[PDB]
Amino acid sequence: TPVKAGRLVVEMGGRCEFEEVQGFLDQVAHKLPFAAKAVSRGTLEKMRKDQEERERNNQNPWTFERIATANMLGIRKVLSPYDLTHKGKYWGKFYMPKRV
Amino acid sequence: KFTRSRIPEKVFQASPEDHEKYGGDPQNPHKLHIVTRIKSTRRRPYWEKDIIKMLGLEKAHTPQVHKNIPSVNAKLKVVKHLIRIKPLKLPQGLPAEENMSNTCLKSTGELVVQWHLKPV
Amino acid sequence: GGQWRLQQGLAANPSGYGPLTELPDWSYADGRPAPPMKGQLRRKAERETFARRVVLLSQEMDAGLQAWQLRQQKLQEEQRKQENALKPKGAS
Amino acid sequence: SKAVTRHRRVMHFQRQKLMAVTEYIPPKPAIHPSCLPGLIRLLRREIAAVFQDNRMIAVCQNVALSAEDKLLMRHQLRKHKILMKVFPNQVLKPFLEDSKYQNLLPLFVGHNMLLVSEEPKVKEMVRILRTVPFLPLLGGCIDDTILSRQGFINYSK
Amino acid sequence: RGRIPGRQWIGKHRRPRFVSLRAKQNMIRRLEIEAENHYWLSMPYMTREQERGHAAVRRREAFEAIKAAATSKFPPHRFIADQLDHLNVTKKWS
RNA sequence: ACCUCGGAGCAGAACCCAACCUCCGAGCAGUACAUGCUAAGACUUCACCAGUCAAAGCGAACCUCAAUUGAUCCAAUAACUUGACCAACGGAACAAGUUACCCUAGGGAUAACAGCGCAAUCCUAUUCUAGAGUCCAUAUCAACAAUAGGGUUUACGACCUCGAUGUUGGAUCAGGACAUCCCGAUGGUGCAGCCGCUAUUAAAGGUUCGUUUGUUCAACGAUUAAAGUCCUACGUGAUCUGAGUUCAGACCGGAGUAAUCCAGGUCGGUUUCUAUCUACUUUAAAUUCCUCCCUGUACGAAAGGACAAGAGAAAUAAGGCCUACUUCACAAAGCGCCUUCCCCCGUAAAUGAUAUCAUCUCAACUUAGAUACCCACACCCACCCAAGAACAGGGUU
RNA sequence: UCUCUUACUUUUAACCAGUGAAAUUGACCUGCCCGUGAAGAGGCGGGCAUAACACAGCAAGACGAGAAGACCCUAUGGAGCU
RNA sequence: CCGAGCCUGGUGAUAGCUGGUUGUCCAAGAUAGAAUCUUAGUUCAACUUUAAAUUUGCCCACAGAACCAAAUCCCCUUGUAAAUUUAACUGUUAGUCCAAAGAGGAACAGCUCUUUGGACACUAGGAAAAAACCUUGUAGAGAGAGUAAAAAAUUUAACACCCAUAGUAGGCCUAAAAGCAGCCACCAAUUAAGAAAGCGUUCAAGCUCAACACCCACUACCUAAAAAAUCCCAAACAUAUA
RNA sequence: ACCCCUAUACCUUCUGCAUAAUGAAUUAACUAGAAAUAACUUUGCAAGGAGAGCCAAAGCUAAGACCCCCGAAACCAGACGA
Ligand SMILES: C[NH+](C)c1cc(NC(=O)CNC(C)(C)C)c(O)c2c1C[C@H]1C[C@H]3[C@H]([NH+](C)C)C(O)=C(C(N)=O)C(=O)[C@@]3(O)C(O)=C1C2=O
Ligand SMILES: [Mg+2]
Ligand SMILES: [Mg+2]
Ligand SMILES: [Mg+2]
Ligand SMILES: [Mg+2]
Ligand SMILES: [Mg+2]
Ligand SMILES: [Mg+2]
Ligand SMILES: [Mg+2]
Ligand SMILES: [Mg+2]
Ligand SMILES: [Mg+2]
Ligand SMILES: [Mg+2]
Ligand SMILES: [Mg+2]
Ligand SMILES: [Mg+2]
Ligand SMILES: [Mg+2]
Ligand SMILES: [Mg+2]
Ligand SMILES: [Mg+2]
Ligand SMILES: [Mg+2]
Ligand SMILES: [Mg+2]
Ligand SMILES: [Mg+2]
Ligand SMILES: [Mg+2]
Ligand SMILES: [Mg+2]
Ligand SMILES: [Mg+2]
Ligand SMILES: [Mg+2]
Ligand SMILES: [Mg+2]
Ligand SMILES: [Mg+2]
Ligand SMILES: [Mg+2]
Ligand SMILES: [Mg+2]
Ligand SMILES: [Mg+2]
Ligand SMILES: [Mg+2]
Ligand SMILES: [Mg+2]
Ligand SMILES: [Mg+2]
Ligand SMILES: [Mg+2]
Ligand SMILES: [Mg+2]
Ligand SMILES: [Mg+2]
Ligand SMILES: [Mg+2]
Ligand SMILES: [Mg+2]
Ligand SMILES: [Mg+2]
Ligand SMILES: [Mg+2]
């Protein structure tokens, strides 16, 4: 089965809180063939607002998406046509959450 | 595959902050471009080499005048990573016939019509 | 110090359009000026061609602008010529 | 190599320079903001009670007093009609400074407890306190005047 | 002791190269020059409809000059003076 | 296995676009009998050949399908026309095997050995904690799975070499790694002791002789402290061997009409080189076993049974010498004799802050924790020598 | 034969004298380690070493010399046999 | 040198195969493909060269190219100066890496196959040496100058203290299963303790946590390896104004 | 003069050779591009040209200028050899 980055692999619910599932969910997600994480609704929302806040307060005048879309320095000779939509956060099957 | 790049018009819309960053009034736009090739056409596609040859920028660091019209602008938009573009400023107006042989271009991009080689 | 020379406006290479590179090398001891140097004659010819190009492009674009102006002038005269040759009758 | 690999592929050096230039730069605060500058009400009800009635107050230090010994002490002290109150200091001190027993204020340090009644009977307080020798009779008040343990003994005899 | 398999800069296993401060600064300088280019191309003088035919006469005459040269390509003249000049190679004193 | 033609993907949107790439088909059928003639303009399978559409006009009337196919010569025919699974499908008019008895021209454009790339396979370490271990995940073993590493196997690729890079095992000499087989130090134990199991550190020193087999291996016999794992062009053939393997002879079984063949067995079968260059050709600290006592002590219910300290006796390795023995004899040798000296780091503890306890401390801190050899120097013609290829050296009173 | 090799003689050998070849040879003022590279460096990179020159010995390297590979493939190249 | 002697002749046999191919100087010049007893070759195209004739050639504005992504086709301006046709021929048609879209294989290979685009087979500087990565091209002399690309940064794990009676060996099941084998409920006294969250017991018994009090305050950086074979490999340096 | 700095012999072959791929000790001498059909250039004459024959809707006549060396195993004929 193909799995792309940002896709929930398994979902759980019930009369419980995070840490209870988080134990064995981190245990499973460590054993997955890719990088994975145990997330909640709250933690998933928190990381998404964190990524948007980092993109908003980034003090670098130059960004990957600006350079790629404007074809700055002729960088599309070494980029890929998929980088126009990945915006540098993806490299092959790898997702880099530190990239803005 | 690697092909020609269509640059967005959102890239080529200027902003007021850009205007005071590089002072140029949106109304009364500058009339002529001073274009200077600052990079090699080697290790670049043949269409960029052809547009460099069309614009007359075969020799590096040699300024050339071009019109500020949309077609020439489209060519410069294609080849914009190998050149530097400045506005041609005319402090003492256009050169006349009597002032044709005493001109200079200068680094600031101002075509002076009197060149005296004397201190002020 | 090319960046400093650019900030002062004196090119970047000191061997460009300055007094140091554009004044005559020598003159006769009695005071007669030397014949002009080959590089200076060449440079003056290129600057002359550059200035003629500047004048030609500026006047060509100006003439294009006024040609468009007179064209549009003939356009709105022909839409303003809208007098009915005949006075309407019938149900009026 | 394919565009997707099981390992991290080596980028073109211009793309690597692109990533290094387009790294994320956080905002830097100028002068470092770190360097920049319930139970209380209910407990107020029962302490207001036990100081409006119950005019024999005795303060003792809450010695360990293992559970059988503690409860059996509770039972002879109740057989002789006194109560053993345990009220925490964090709500009992402010009541003292705004309720005038500020001279009994500097005495409620450490573990503390209150031997409290409406009847004078300091005689078995002192005999039970002498049966258990490691039990101090820290202090207290009889008839709204402050009395030390020497107070408590001459009011006894 | 430390060798990269195969060739250094091609293949699955390459010698790593790292970005230096001056390489980053050089690239940022070029980025600034192109942002300058973006601004000056963002401000145009005329429009396409105003531009439509302003240099057609000059371009046409330039092409007529090219055609005139390419048509005037033709052999050169020949001279009695040149032939009888070649007679001078036996010009003696006496 | 395929060879010609067509449709779909790869090849998303003008065209084109490969693979012994992924799928589906074709080598016709049905109608008509103007399925006649002629003729602008075009398309085109990347060339040519071949193929495709068609206005108008004359004459009539009032083709479907996707491929559904074959050039020239020549043959048949009065003519019009008609001829190949020429399917190796741009087609030679008509021709198979075998060669180790082989030859030639070339090819590292291309295989075998070796190197290299890669790591599927192989090997190791960690992470997780199911499970096994009476209970107990973590004394020990370990499923599913994840991460990282090695380059010893079998491949895969075809990059150097085919105007030669000689090959398996064996001898001889070994250099190196440590992922340690023994000896050393240490932690844990389901460690009472003896034995073990597991882990950390340690590469100075060591790691046997035989029967069968060409064998690497493997099995067995007898030991030992141990009989390590690898790499070195599967180290090492201008140092050796040639049992094997893949030249010419022959036999057996099988295959083939036969020649001949077998990734089957068997018997036999030439291993050249006078060293030009590089490199090198005398660098004194040795380990291990056993015996005695400690001691039948510690320990243990008993059976069993130590570690330290110390004494002795050997064995090998290195260096040397002939008194005797022995080969032998103005001498050279071993089978004989003599000598052989330092540590080594894993961790275990004390004081004591960050964190007024504690804490062995990437806190400050405390403890366990070499000498020897050589050393002077135009007597030199010549002679002698325990010195020596020449040279050099020692003696000549 | 070997454990396990030792001693002597002859030849060879080395020195003096006489005579005097061959294969080989791009040029050489011809080092070591690691890395690199047509993927195994005396000659390239980083380090280390380094007065010159004979004589004897060795065979680890010069992918050492010899024979336009004896295996494999190719050729609209041959030949023998059935 | 007998799988068919040797000599002479045919004979200068033939060789899509190897080797070689001799003055000087300048210029233009790099690889779509189809057939083929063909894939070590050749012919046609494609590219390339020369000489002519003529007029448009590249870049491209809007509109436009089908139902079941990057882009391309077409194309007036504009920027430029090339293009087509005519004549005459050679040679190249055994291809390498890098970026991108894919296919095969192991989402192996310095692997193989197409497509778009670079560079290499041509110069120079840089990434250590260096084909293919980066910078840069049109030629000479100079004991002048401004620059391009261009030098890797990182160092990680301290965590509380004190306390604990009891309705009850809650009920059912079981020999007993007592908070802790499995089920139903989960109330309730003390100031404050789950009909018990881990251990531990055949079951019991025991010891930790959550709870009172106590108090300064939970102090809380949320992170993580190592191996091979001749000999580690520039020397080094935290602090003088970009 | 060396010492300092720069610098990977040549030819062929190749995708690419310092290559540890080929050839070469060195000297002297010898040793390898032959031509038609057309085209192009330059003359002569010109609806004709060429010293019969041939070509001709500007052609014809003349000249110039363009196509290597070495090498097999083999096949056949006639001799000479026990
Ligand atoms: C060395 N021997 C075992 C041998 C081996 C092979 N085969 C190999 O190359 C096999 N080597 C491998 C194992 C594949 C690496 C061989 O191929 C040969 C030979 C021998 C030669 C003998 C030749 C001989 N001459 C040249 C010395 C000769 O005169 C005769 C003769 N009888 O007249 C030959 O037969 C001889 O030419 C020959 O045939 C040999 C080989 O072919
Ligand atoms: Mg390498
Ligand atoms: Mg066509
Ligand atoms: Mg019709
Ligand atoms: Mg065929
Ligand atoms: Mg065919
Ligand atoms: Mg045989
Ligand atoms: Mg041969
Ligand atoms: Mg191999
Ligand atoms: Mg279990
Ligand atoms: Mg290949
Ligand atoms: Mg070979
Ligand atoms: Mg050779
Ligand atoms: Mg050889
Ligand atoms: Mg170890
Ligand atoms: Mg070997
Ligand atoms: Mg050898
Ligand atoms: Mg043979
Ligand atoms: Mg025999
Ligand atoms: Mg030999
Ligand atoms: Mg040498
Ligand atoms: Mg002699
Ligand atoms: Mg090397
Ligand atoms: Mg020697
Ligand atoms: Mg050969
Ligand atoms: Mg062929
Ligand atoms: Mg020939
Ligand atoms: Mg040229
Ligand atoms: Mg063919
Ligand atoms: Mg061929
Ligand atoms: Mg390749
Ligand atoms: Mg090759
Ligand atoms: Mg090279
Ligand atoms: Mg060499
Ligand atoms: Mg060779
Ligand atoms: Mg060579
Ligand atoms: Mg060769
Ligand atoms: Mg023949």
Ligand SMILES: [Mg+2]
């Ligand atoms: Mg006879």
